[PDB]
Amino acid sequence: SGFRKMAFPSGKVEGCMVQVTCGTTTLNGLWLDDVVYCPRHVICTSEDMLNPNYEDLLIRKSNHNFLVQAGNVQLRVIGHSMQNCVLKLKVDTANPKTPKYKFVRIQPGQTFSVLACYNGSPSGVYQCAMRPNFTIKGSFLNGSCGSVGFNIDYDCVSFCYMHHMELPTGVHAGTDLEGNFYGPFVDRQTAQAAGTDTTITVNVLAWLYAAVINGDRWFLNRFTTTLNDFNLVAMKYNYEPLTQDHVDILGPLSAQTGIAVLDMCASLKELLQNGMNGRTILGSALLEDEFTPFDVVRQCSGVT
Amino acid sequence: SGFRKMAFPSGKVEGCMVQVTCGTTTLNGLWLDDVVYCPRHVICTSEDMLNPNYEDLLIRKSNHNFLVQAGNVQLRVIGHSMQNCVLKLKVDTANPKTPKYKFVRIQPGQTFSVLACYNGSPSGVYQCAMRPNFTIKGSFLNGSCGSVGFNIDYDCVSFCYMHHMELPTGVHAGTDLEGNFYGPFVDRQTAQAAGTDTTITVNVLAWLYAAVINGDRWFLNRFTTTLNDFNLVAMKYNYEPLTQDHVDILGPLSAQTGIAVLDMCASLKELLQNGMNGRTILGSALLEDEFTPFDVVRQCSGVT
């Protein structure tokens, strides 16, 4: 029993973190095999962040200008190239701690663990979600760029995020491991619109299923609804429209609890229309949307 | 910017997790140097959990009855002994992955990271606090016993908790690494009273300071209070009484923000008396108490 905002164990990712310095800028890098991946703005000073021409700035940089340190040892840089918004620094030594890995571009609403890093050293791990507006509500200070987001399937690490930027709003933007930003964001210090952040409806329903499993049942009611009726309410509350794909994914949790997905939708509808009335669900006074249906089954079954 | 319920990186602890089996019972063990620490109820079947005589049960067990597996390799057990509620299994091989470590008995209100484990394999990491009633609101299923709680200071791991039990209430009880339970709990399957769970006032104030630092300021008011006046309100709301020691520890956050500790107390008093009125603080609709003043400074300064 108990339901926590749980992150994946970070050991496999810690063994990949390195420090990358170029000129006066220092950030984190990800060392997998003989390649170190990092945000391309490592070649930038604060001044050229206003309007950088990355290709022109990179021309002034040679292999020896990229200092890569793993713990206390220096890595020899034998190659450099820019792939979208990331630099790939080829080093002469394969990371002996490279786990089995994949690079994946996650979908909005999917969750992942972040290993926040400063100077190539890990400071903390937390779980978060890719918001529908392609931002992440992280916890990142200056120097945390190059910190990565990931998921683990038994022994395989699927890297899905690389931290690059903090918006003036305090939320975070970054890329997949091929250097493509999630959302419309550019690696420029300019005013950028994040967009309307809607609630991940399928995740809130999964979390309601987790609450029933863990004993919190006060919110279950005598009502049902339809997908279209529920969606009229979800629209009014800036909740993502629920589809049959979402209903299908909630299948296992619906079977585990014996509560039909549309009946759970009616409970959600009533919570949206009436509020929590001063009560809590799984120690929260708001509807939590950073647990996917897969996360709930995993945490409630103890997959290692 | 951003404030997350952040856990320590778990790599150092993952390298210590092993599986311990005795008879038909399997749980987790902690391998440090040539010793494996685990809950003493590993010698128990479900039947003798009702009223076990651990010393009599242990008499029927020899070194070869304790199977200790680290990954896929078996460890040879050359010694066994019971220290309070934990067993110490001496093995013939020192853990090559043993980090610098200490065993510490934490104080109620202190926080720590938990690496939940099943069959000696890590499944997830989350941050939690030792409640004033000596329980932890964890996320643990059957098989998670022997999972440990810890803190990290640069490279030293301070082990502070070993999971043993889930109370009928759904909360968790366990021991320090010398086998002494936190609180009044016994390792018996019997009805046990957890006690009144009060809110950790100094932690809520630290979290309010973190909110001001991260930009959420709506709750700051034009009022002040005294320690005695504040405590009259804290009593009414089952909040821990605030002392001058708590005020002194909030010193650095008070200096960082320029908000006197008693002025922040008045903001807290008003939030307790008036509620949140449908608003949030750091993405929460309730007052969060699982961040110590040390946690807030660390997360807001990026200590690795």
Ligand SMILES: O=C1[C@H](c2cccc(Cl)c2)CCCN1c1cncc2ccccc12
């Ligand atoms: O956002 C940035 C800068 C930036 C500006 C424009 C585009 C890009 Cl790609 C990056 C570069 C310096 C580091 N950085 C930061 C990244 N995360 C958290 C931060 C917390 C406080 C202060 C800066 C932070």
Ligand SMILES: O=C1[C@H](c2cccc(Cl)c2)CCCN1c1cncc2ccccc12
């Ligand atoms: O609580 C217990 C049992 C127990 C009973 C009485 C005293 C002691 Cl020391 C231990 C032993 C089996 C595992 N266990 C569990 C520990 N944590 C989470 C659990 C979630 C669901 C079911 C059992 C859980």
